[PDB]
Amino acid sequence: DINIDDILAELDKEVSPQQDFSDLMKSWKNERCSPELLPYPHQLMKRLLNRISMQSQLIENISMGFLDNESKLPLLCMETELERLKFVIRSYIRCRLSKIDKFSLYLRQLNEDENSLISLTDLLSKDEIKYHDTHSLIWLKLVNDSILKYMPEELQAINDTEGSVNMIDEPDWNKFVFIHVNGPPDGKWNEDPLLQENEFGKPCYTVTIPDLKEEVELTIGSIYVMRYEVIRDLLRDDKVALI
Amino acid sequence: MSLPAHLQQTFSPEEIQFIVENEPIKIFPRITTRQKIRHTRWQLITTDDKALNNMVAMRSTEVVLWIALLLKQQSKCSIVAPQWLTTKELDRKIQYEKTHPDRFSELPWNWLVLARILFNKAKDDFHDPIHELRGKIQDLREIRQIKVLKGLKYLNESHLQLDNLSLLEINELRPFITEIMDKLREIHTASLT
Amino acid sequence: TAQNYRVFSVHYSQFHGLSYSLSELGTSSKRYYKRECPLPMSLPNIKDANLDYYNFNPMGIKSLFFSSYGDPCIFGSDNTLLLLSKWRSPEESKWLPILDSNMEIWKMSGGKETTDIHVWPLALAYDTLNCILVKGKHIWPEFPLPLPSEMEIRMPVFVKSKLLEENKEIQIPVSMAAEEEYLRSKVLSELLTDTLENDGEMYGNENEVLAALNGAYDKALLRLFASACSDQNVEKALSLAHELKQDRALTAAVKISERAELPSLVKKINNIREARYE
Numbered sequence: 260d261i262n263i264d265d266i267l268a269e270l271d272k273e274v275s276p277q278q279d280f281s282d283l284m285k286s287w288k289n290e291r292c293s294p295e296l297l298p299y300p301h302q303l304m305k306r307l308l309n310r311i312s313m314q315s316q317l318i319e320n321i322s323m324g325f326l327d328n329e330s331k332l333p334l335l336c337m338e339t340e341l342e343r344l345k346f347v348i349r350s351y352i353r354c355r356l357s358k359i360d361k362f363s364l365y366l367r368q369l370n371e372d373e374n375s376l377i378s379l380t381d382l383l384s385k386d387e388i389k390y391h392d393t394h395s396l397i398w399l400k401l402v403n404d405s406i407l408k409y410m411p412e413e414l415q416a417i418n419d420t421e422g423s424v425n426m427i428d429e430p431d432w433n434k435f436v437f438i439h440v441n442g443p444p445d446g447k448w449n450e451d452p453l454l455q456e457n458e459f460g461k462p463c464y465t466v467t468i469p470d471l472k473e474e475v476e477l478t479i480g481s482i483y484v485m486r487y488e489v490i491r492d493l494l495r496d497d498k499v500a501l502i
Numbered sequence: 503m504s505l506p507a508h509l510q511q512t513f514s515p516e517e518i519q520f521i522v523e524n525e526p527i528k529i530f531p532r533i534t535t536r537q538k539i540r541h542t543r544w545q546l547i548t549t550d551d552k553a554l555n556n557m558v559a560m561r562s563t564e565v566v567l568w569i570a571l572l573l574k575q576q577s578k579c580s581i582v583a584p585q586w587l588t589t590k591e592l593d594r595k596i597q598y599e600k601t602h603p604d605r606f607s608e609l610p611w612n613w614l615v616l617a618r619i620l621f622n623k624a625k626d627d628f629h630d631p632i633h634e635l636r637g638k639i640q641d642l643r644e645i646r647q648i649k650v651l652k653g654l655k656y657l658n659e660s661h662l663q664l665d666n667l668s669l670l671e672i673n674e675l676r677p678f679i680t681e682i683m684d685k686l687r688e689i690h691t692a693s694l695t
Numbered sequence: 696t697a698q699n700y701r702v703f704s705v706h707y708s709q710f711h712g713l714s715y716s717l718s719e720l721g722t723s724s725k726r727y728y729k730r731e732c733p734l735p736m737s738l739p740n741i742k743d744a745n746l747d748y749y750n751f752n753p754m755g756i757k758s759l760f761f762s763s764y765g766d767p768c769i770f771g772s773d774n775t776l777l778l779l780s781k782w783r784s785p786e787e788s789k790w791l792p793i794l795d796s797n798m799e800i801w802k803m804s805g806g807k808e809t810t811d812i813h814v815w816p817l818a819l820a821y822d823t824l825n826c827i828l829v830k831g832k833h834i835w836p837e838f839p840l841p842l843p844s845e846m847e848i849r850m851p852v853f854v855k856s857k858l859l860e861e862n863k864e865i866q867i868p869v870s871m872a873a874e875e876e877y878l879r880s881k882v883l884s885e886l887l888t889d890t891l892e893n894d895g896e897m898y899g900n901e902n903e904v905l906a907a908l909n910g911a912y913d914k915a916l917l918r919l920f921a922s923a924c925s926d927q928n929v930e931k932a933l934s935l936a937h938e939l940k941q942d943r944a945l946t947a948a949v950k951i952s953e954r955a956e957l958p959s960l961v962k963k964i965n966n967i968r969e970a971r972y973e
Contacts (some may be wrong), residue, residue, distance in 0.1 A: 267914060270947045282550040284524065291513065310547050311796050318546065332578070333544045336554075336569060342569065343520075350517075357505035378836045433687060434684055435680040437664075437672055470691055471660055482672070484662040484679055486687070502672050504765055530842055538897050560843055562822050629828070631842055 274453060279306055282342065283472065285500060287351045292501035293494075294434040294487055296358045296366070298382050314341060352384075359383070359391050363398075364418045364427045432488040437502035440464070442479040444497045453498075454479075464493060512676050518669055522615040523568040529556040529580040531573075567616075571623055580622040586610065587617065589630045591677040599645045606646060606666035612644065614670045646671060657682050659690045698761035702878050706731060707754065707770070713738070714966050717767060717782060723972065724854060728782055735790050739772040744832050762819040764890045770816040776824060776848070777820040784891065792883055802853070805864050817843050821904075823847065849920050850878040877915035884908050913944035920948055924955035942971060 269368060286300050303427040318337050325334075361368065370379045383391060399417060407415050419426050442462070443451045453464050466489050477483060477493075493499045508514070513521075535543075535557045544554040557563060560583060565573075573579035585591055586609065598607040610616075612660045617639045625632055650671070656662065657679065664672070696703045702718040717728040720885045739745075739755040749755065755772025762768055767779040776794040781787045796814045804812070814832045815827040817945035824922065825843040827836045840970045852875050853867070861868055896902065916939050923932035945968060 261921050261925045261951065263917065263951060263954075266947050266950050266954070267917065270914065270917070270944060274648065275944070284521070288521075289510075292511070314545075314547050321542070328541055330542050332573075333542045333554075336572065337545055338636055339568075340548055344548055346520075353504045354509075357503045357510070360503045419596045431684075433691075435683045435687070437676065437680075450556065468660055473660055473662055481663060481665045482667060484664065484683060486661075502669065536898065539899055540894075540897065558820075560818075560825060561823075562845055582842065626839070627842060629830075630846075 274306075274321065276310060279310075280347075283307060283347055285350070287354075289494065290351060290354050291502045292436055294432070295361055295432045295491075296355060296382060296430070296437075299355075299384050299387070301384075304348075304384070307344070309344065311348075355387065356390060359387055360394070361428065362430065363391065363395050365429050365502055366394065367418065368427055416496055433486045435484055436487050436490065438477075438483050438485050438490055438494075438499045440477045440479050440481055440483065440499050440502050442498070451498075453493075464498065466490075466493070511680075512544065513673055515670070516674070518673055519615060519619070519671075521669070522612045522619070523566075523571070524565050525612065526564045526617075527567045527570045527584075528562050528564050529573070530560050530562055530580045530582060531568050532559055533557060533573075534559045557588060558692070567619075571619070574624055577610050579617070581620060583620060583624070583628055584616070586613070587620070587635060589634050589638065592635070592642065595637065596641050599649075600633065603649070603652075606664075607642075608666050609642070609668065611669045612669050613642045614639070650675065654679070659683070659686050659688060696759045696761065696858045696917075697769075698765055701761060701765055703759065703761065703767045705734060705754075705756065705759065718777075726866070729785060731786070734769075734797070736769055736771040736777060737773040738787055744834070748834050757814075758816045760816070760818055762886075763821055764886065765894065766886055766890075768819050770842065774814060775851075776816065778819070778886075780882065781889060783889060791849040792848060792851050793879075793882070795849070795853075796824075798851065798853055798855065799846060799849055802858075802865050806862055807858065814846070819848075821887075821934060822848060848879065850875050850882070869918070873918040873922075877912060877919065880908055880912040880915060884912065909940055913939055913941050917944065917947050917951065920951055920957075924951055924957060926962075927955075927957065929957055929959050932957070934962070936964055937967060942968065945971075 282300065282303055286303070287299070305384075314337065318341070319332060320332065321337075325331075335467060366379060366382075369375050369377055369382075370493050379391075380388065403415075404415065407417070417426065443454065448462060454462050454491055455465070456462050457476065457478065457484065463478040465474055465476050467474050468486060468489050474485075475485075477485075477499070488500060494501070508693055535555055544551050546554075549569070553565055554569070570579060570581050574581055586595075595607045595609060617635075620627075620634060621632060621639075628635060646667075650667075653662070654662070662679070662683075700719050700721045702716075702720060704716045704718075705716045706716065708785045711731075713734040715730070715734045716730045719726045721729065732823065739749055739753075741749065757770045757772075757774075759770075760768050761904050762778065767782065768776060770776050774796045775792050776796065777790045778793050780789050800809055800812055801807070802812070806835045807955040811827045811830055811832070812825075813859050815834075815836055817825045817827070817830050819825070824846045826846060829836050829841075853871065857868065857871065858865060884905060887901060887908065891901060891905065906916055916935055921934055923935055932952070936945065939945050939948060945964060949964045952958075
């Protein structure tokens with residue numbers, strides 16, 4: 260049989276608001292579910308905060324025409340869509356503000372560490388850099404006055420890593436998370452160097468979990484309970500999403 | 503903190519509903535919004551506007567589920583249940599479930615969530631009698647709950663695989679499976695030199 | 696039946712047989728397109744599941760309607776939807792059987808000879824019969840009217856015996872599937888073309904539908920040309936290439952003939968390019 264389909268595909272070949280919302284939903288789901296503070300979607304967030312400002316002005320402008328068919332369902336939908344969209348962004352920001360609270364001394368440690376692999380301004384919004392730096396002084400003043408004032412000088416450090424317990428609470432890198440194995444974000448599987456076939460045909464990624472010296476194959480389109488430290492590189496590269 | 507404690511590592515069932523309401527669903531419009539060649543318009547920013555400004559009464563179309571429910575709240579729509587919400591396709595999935603103890607059947611990730619939404623909001627739009635659909639959604643819910651209880655005998659230091667488990671079935675188990683596998687990992691890594 | 700100024704009537708008597716008339720009465724320029732022409736539609740083969748219906752409707756016309764584009768349709772006792780083609784010019788008119796809905800039900804129920812299911816037609820929007828699929832021992836629907844289902848129209852080129860041997864969900868042989876898509880596209884492109892030329896568009900989309908519909912015709916013919924090359928019937932292949940519309944799609948025919956190593960077809964196709972360019 261002569262298989263034509265590549266000739267038919269070459270004959271056949273003759274950023275958007277709908278896409279950015281789908282990246283906000285990915286970001287919100289991964290941020291809720293991950294133990295780490297993920298890096299902020301800088302350009303995505305600037306785009307969405309424009310569209311909310313322009314759309315909220317448009318809904319008010321259309322409501323000026325109603326003073327003078329004149330069906331109201333599209334006004335109702337444009338309004339309920341802004342409530343649905345503003346909720347995802349509020350729930351997203353309130354979630355990552357909660358992680359800046361937990362990780363203040365760890366983020367301060369990445370910022371005092373001049374040799375760091377990460378700059379804090381890669382990781383945080385301008386309003387999160389504001390929240391972080393000032394919530395740290397507000398809390399530090401509270402404890403520093405209220406109880407640290409009385410301590411001997413070598414115990415006055417709020418962030419002593421040398422003591423009997425480390426005071427800097429780091430993320431739980433090995434948290435178990437549920438993942439759904441997307442495959443590459445492009446449908447074009449042949450690009451990917453990590454991906455490979457199996458027996459039963461089906462493709463997968465292989466990852467080694469180093470404490471146990473165990474390889475595991477993450478077959479595409481299936482759900483695993485898996486340690487986050489093993490997933491990070493696949494999650495940053497969009498190969499998997501957190502359920 | 504900024505985020506309530508009951509949300510700190512998981513989704514509320516109302517957030518799992520909100521995620522499912524972002525999916526496309528097929529509808530039969532009861533309004534013609536399509537203007538003839540021979541007016542207000544939708545102008546949305548998170549979903550495809552071009553599907554709604556082109557409605558014609560009783561020709562099917564796809565819209566995002568939260569708009570289908572908002573139209574169906576007036577008489578202005580009817581919601582076409584997916585093919586898997588048929589008494590034939592549910593009964594093939596129940597047979598698959600009974601036949602393969604080792605696996606969950608290939609139901610879509612949102613099947614419990616979408617069944618619960620449409621049985622409450624679109625109760626009149628099923629071709630099959632809704633009391634037999636509710637009956638088979640429960641038959642599927644119960645078989646998968648046995649297979650989950652069998653799966654939890656294997657909580658592990660390394661991983662699990664849970665191939666066709668729904669988002670709502672993952673979301674009830676999340677704060678148990680992950681909390682126990684976290685203590686099995688802490689007890690294990692503590693033993694290492 | 697009527698739709699706007701068009702009227703379509705079916706006539707019957709022992710002394711005349713079945714016939715139809717089609718009219719366009721208008722606020723001015725009244726015309727009768729056809730008066731009492733014979734109608735090629737089957738009357739029933741004259742238990743109470745049928746007889747309680749045929750006592751009520753002896754002709755077995757389940758519905759009579761115009762399509763949304765104003766071409767007459769009739770759905771008879773034989774469950775076949777017939778659409779009248781090219782009627783605006785009477786010397787070129789024909790009835791097209793565009794659904795054999797008994798076959799289209801057997802196909803979707805996985806090849807069971809299926810008695811508990813009946814179609815009840817409402818309208819032909821372009822390309823798709825709105826209808827109730829009724830279930831049970833009565834042919835007709837009940838008071839909480841179920842949603843109109845949609846059946847996509849299919850030309851009756853499905854040989855049930857070939858479908859039986861290749862299935863023993865139904866899979867359709869890709870030659871049979873290409874033969875239907877080529878025929879279905881050829882009839883629909885002629886209905887649109889005549890509407891757009893005689894009435895004009897009512898939605899701006901119709902010219903972009905027609906462009907997309909020609910695209911599905913040429914892709915169906917190239918999928919038949921591949922079978923003709925696989926069976927090395929160079930003559931059948933050249934006939935399939937000659938009916939092909941887009942000059943840009945005829946490039947795919949020469950590519951397929953090289954892939955098949957049939958160099959006679961290569962030269963012959965090059966003659967078609969120049970002839971159609973001129």
